[PDB]
Amino acid sequence: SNWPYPRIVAHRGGGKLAPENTLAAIDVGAKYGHKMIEFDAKLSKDGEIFLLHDDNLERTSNGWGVAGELNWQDLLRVDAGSWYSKAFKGEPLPLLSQVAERCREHGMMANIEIKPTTGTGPLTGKMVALAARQLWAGMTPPLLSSFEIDALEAAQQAAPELPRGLLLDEWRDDWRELTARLGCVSIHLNHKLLDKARVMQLKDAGLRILVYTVNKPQHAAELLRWGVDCICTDAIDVIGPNFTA
């Protein structure tokens, strides 16, 4: 299967240089020349698609409790920036429609990680998949990702054409049968789980491979030499869009 995605991917928009999953972070990503961003998507209670990694608002904002349990008109009141620096005072939870727009303006590719509120995978998978289809018309198709077989299955029905990747934070002996059934172009793995061998056999099974979250250049280089296709990094200043081994 064909593969337009860059070697390097900016984790949550701006890596650790800016407040994650934010419009401003995606800007920071473009300021270091990055060609592709990864970011985490969910549903509000009323079904707007916006970005937030966690189930709960606390870690990356001045809000509290389960984001998915609030209506968009209320998520609009949240500051998802000043937790990071005094400079990001404005910073709102961004809609997916807005992120698609930044991508177009900065000429960036997108890895949308479907990151549903616990219990909402199927609904979240379907909705994100159809919204991705609409908003990325005329553009590099976005790479849909998830830890939930839940959400990947729903994306496989709602938008078959959109390519898909399986996120694993831990190794699974059945990765071959699972990726095959899901119809994945890619497998997205925590970097600790790799070595020359697994890279080799993942490749032989026909899969593209992305890794996260790799910050040290020597280990980025190594992974690229083994055969990995994307390094998802937090250190967007040091790794950098034209990195090579």
Delineate the domains of the chain, giving CATH numbers in brackets: 7-234 (3.20.20.190)
Residues 115, 149 contacting (CB under 8 angstroms)? no
Residues 6+ apart with CB under 8 A from 244: 7, 221, 224
Resolution in angstroms for this experimental structure? 2.6
Give CA angle at 103 (99, 105), nearest 5°: 115
SS3 (DSSP) at 87 = helix
Residues 6+ apart with CB under 8 A from 123: 43, 116, 154
Residues 50, 94 contacting (CB under 8 angstroms)? yes
Closest CA to 43 of 124, 135, 158: 124
Amino acid at site 19: P
DSSP string, 7-57: SEEETTTTTTSS-SSSHHHHHHHHHTT-SEEEEEEEE-TT--EEE-SSSBS
**Catalytic residue numbers, as ranges:** 11, 53
Query: DSSP H helical segments within the chain, as ranges?
Result: 23-31, 72-75, 96-105, 121-135, 149-158, 175-182, 196-204, 217-226
Tokens 């509000």 belong to 44
Stated length of the chain: 245
